[PDB]
Design a protein around this ligand. Structure first.
Ligand SMILES: OC[C@H]1O[C@H](O)[C@H](O)[C@@H](O)[C@@H]1O
Ligand SMILES: OC[C@H]1O[C@H](O)[C@H](O)[C@@H](O)[C@@H]1O
Length: 686
């Protein structure tokens, strides 16, 4: 007694779904699993709707041209076959179910349209489209019509349109040019004008759909129809003496029918992926499985070599193969879908007489171009959005790792600087007398009277976006001793203090340099250069440097206290919002009042509005797919904070620190970063 495992399949209702049912049974007799196959209308439109919310079928059958869109939306699981299995099916059938180098369905059958004619009514079928009108009035004058076929789905009409120059995209040597779309060129117009003239001269009827045609030919009311393999069973059971042959030519050139590979995709949202594989690989794609479907509705030229070889001597299949060679295989790109919609209306309008042929096709080219554009953009968006996770999976570790001693210059460059990952180096500052000497008492006896440039801000956030402005801190020149007073509580000051950022010898502040080093020698030998700056850092515990990135190799050394960093690799850029801001600077008056004051004749300054501590996920939801790294640097410790790394600094009260700025190498890594940042803004990711 259960409510248990199942396998539901969607397949179009012109295909042998009863044959597929039987195969479903032999499954259900060899496991307990009930296999139910369904043929809903517009199943290929329903699937991408319903499968994203998690519902939908387990397996979907359709011509392969639909299967790329399904994969661009991530609805199709990757199929993983043995190679004893991949060499069981023809190679080009696998290539039709390959999106962005990856397999997304199992190929079932290769199908193309052919000219089905009534051998009793028409002993020698026409070789040209141009004969058909002549042939029609000769047959109306015997009580029937010459040619009938579905005029409601562009798939049937397209072999003629493409004959004299029509083409979707462009399949010149190598593969498809998605800039070169050709649905409103001379040759497209020619075939379509011909189709429309057939209707005009009442050789055909614009209202004719699939069902009207099939019924007509199978009753012997039409000498010729145009259909694919699935249609043959219903004529065999009718008793029209019929043949299947090469499509007639137009203006001396062959009809070019888009070739379709019936494919089975697996629903990425299925709880049954592995039974789906046991069903298709080992029950359907067999001589036994394809036979049971084919007995119902002929599949065409199958993908399974074994059973393809056993059937290929059917003149109906040979003819199918002939027309497929004269035609071109459909691309599976997600642009296929809007292409069909565009031509569907183009044909339906030109045949009904609503628009001329020359405008219907013009409209279809224009409107399909506009979608082909937005589709391109979305493909770019995903590339940029899947990139950040792709990167950190490969190089960027989720923690800042510690070294127990300084690395060799070689090892420092090969392990950290070139791969652009941070680390904390230990036991590298123990030769600094600063580590023992630098007390807020020794600093007061040593540089207490020395006047420095001090950063004043109302809320502790220097260089942050405040409303519509990027605001820089107020500057006040104070001795260090009264910086220390305000920090120990002994005195008071408007806002939040912290010492600004070139001291140790260019401020000046030279009495401390002897307590430190002018550079990190193993770092300098590694980067092949001296630091551009050496900065002394002292400040309030409310000073929060906001999220930004530097064009410098920064060695952050902590002498007393702690430093709390929140890092993001340059890779996380597509998910880090950037805006453009009017640059300002705080003015502090002798009232303790902070006023925002636009920086005159400065360029707009790009900055990150996002607050990584408490992010507005409503305004910036994309940021929740970034991956922050956290570390804490403390007394005696040195953080290597690579170039272009997004960082956000906090510290304990009265934290003292020295940091070296080496200029970065402007290299391939930099140039790529500019490219991404630019593509992030163009594609409106922000
Ligand atoms: O409506 C036209 C359709 O007819 C058949 O189902 C073909 O398999 C499919 O490729 C074609 O698109
Ligand atoms: O007529 C156009 C239709 O036929 C072709 C494809 O099989 C189908 O995906 C498409 O929509």
């Amino acid at each position: 007694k259960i409510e248990e495992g199942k396998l539901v399949i969607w397949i179009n209702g012109d295909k042998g779904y009863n044959g597929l049912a039987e195969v479903g049974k032999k499954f259900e007799k060899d496991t307990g699993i009930k296999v139910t196959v369904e043929h809903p209308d517009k199943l290929e439109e329903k699937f991408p709707q319903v499968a994203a919310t998690g519902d939908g079928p387990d397996i979907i059958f359709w011509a392969h041209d639909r299967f790329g869109g399904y994969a661009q939306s991530g609805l199709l699981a990757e199929i993983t076959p043995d190679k004893a299995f991949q060499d069981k099916l023809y190679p080009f059938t696998w290539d039709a179910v390959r999106y962005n180098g990856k397999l997304i369905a199992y190929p079932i059958a290769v199908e193309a349209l052919s000219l089905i004619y009534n051998k009793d009514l028409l002993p020698n079928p026409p070789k040209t489209w141009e004969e058909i009108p002549a042939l029609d009035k000769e047959l109306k004058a015997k009580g029937k019509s010459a040619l009938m076929f579905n005029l409601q789905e562009p798939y049937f009409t397209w072999p003629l349109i493409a004959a004299d120059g029509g083409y979707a995209f462009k399949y010149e040597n190598g593969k498809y040019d998605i800039k070169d779309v050709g649905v409103d060129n001379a040759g497209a117009k020619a075939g379509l004008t011909f189709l429309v003239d057939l209707i005009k001269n009442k050789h055909m009827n614009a209202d004719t759909d699939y069902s009207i045609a099939e019924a007509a030919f199978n009753k012997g009311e039409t000498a010729m129809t145009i259909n694919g393999p699935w249609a043959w069973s219903n004529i065999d059971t009718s008793k029209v003496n019929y043949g299947v042959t090469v499509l007639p030519t137009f203006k001396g050139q062959p009809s070019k029918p888009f070739v379709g590979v019936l494919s089975a995709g697996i629903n990425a949202a299925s709880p049954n992926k592995e039974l789906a594989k046991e069903f298709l690989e080992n029950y359907l794609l067999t001589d036994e499985g394809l036979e049971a479907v084919n007995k119902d509705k002929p599949l065409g030229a199958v993908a399974l070599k074994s059973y393809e070889e056993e059937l290929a001597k059917d003149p109906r299949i040979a003819a199918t193969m002939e027309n497929a060679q004269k035609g071109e295989i459909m691309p599976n790109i997600p642009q296929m879908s809007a292409f069909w919609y565009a031509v569907r209306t183009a044909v339906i309008n030109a045949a009904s007489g609503r628009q001329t042929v020359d405008e219907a096709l013009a409209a279809a080219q224009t409107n399909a171009a506009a979608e082909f554009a937005e589709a391109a953009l979305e493909a770019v968006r995903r590339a940029l959005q899947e990139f950040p996770a792709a990167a950190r999976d490969l190089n960027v570790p989720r923690v800042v790792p510690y070294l127990d001693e300084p690395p060799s210059p070689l090892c420092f460059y090969r392990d950290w600087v070139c791969p652009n990952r941070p680390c904390i180096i230990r036991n590298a500052l123990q030769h600094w007398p600063a580590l023992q000497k630098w007390s807020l008492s020794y600093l007061r006896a040593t540089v207490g009277s020395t006047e420095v440039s001090v950063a004043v801000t109302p809320d502790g956030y220097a260089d942050a976006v405040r409303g519509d402005r990027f605001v820089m801190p107020a500057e006040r020149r104070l001795p260090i001793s009264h910086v220390l007073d305000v920090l120990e509580g002994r005195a008071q000051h408007p806002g939040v203090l912290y010492v600004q950022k070139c001291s140790n010898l260019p401020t000046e502040l030279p009495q401390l340099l002897s307590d430190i080093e002018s550079h990190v020698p193993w770092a300098s030998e590694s980067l092949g250069k001296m630091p551009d700056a050496v900065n002394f850092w002292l400040g309030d515990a409310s000073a929060v440097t906001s999220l930004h990135k530097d064009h410098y190799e920064n060695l952050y050394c902590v002498v007393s206290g702690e430093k709390h960093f929140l890092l993001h690799p340059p890779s996380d850029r597509p998910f880090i919002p950037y805006n453009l801001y009017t640059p300002a600077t705080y003015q502090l008056t002798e009232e303790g009042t902070f006023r925002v004051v636009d920086e005159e004749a400065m360029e707009k300054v790009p900055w990150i509005p996002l607050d990584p501590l408490a992010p507005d996920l409503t305004q910036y939801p994309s940021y929740s797919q970034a991956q922050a790294l956290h570390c804490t640097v403390r007394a005696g410790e040195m953080l290597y904070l690579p170039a272009l790394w997004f960082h956000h600094v906090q510290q304990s009260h009265g934290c003292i620190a020295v940091n070296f700025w080496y200029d970065m190498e402007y290299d391939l890594k930099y140039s790529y970063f500019q490219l991404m940042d630019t593509l992030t803004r163009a594609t409106g990711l922000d």
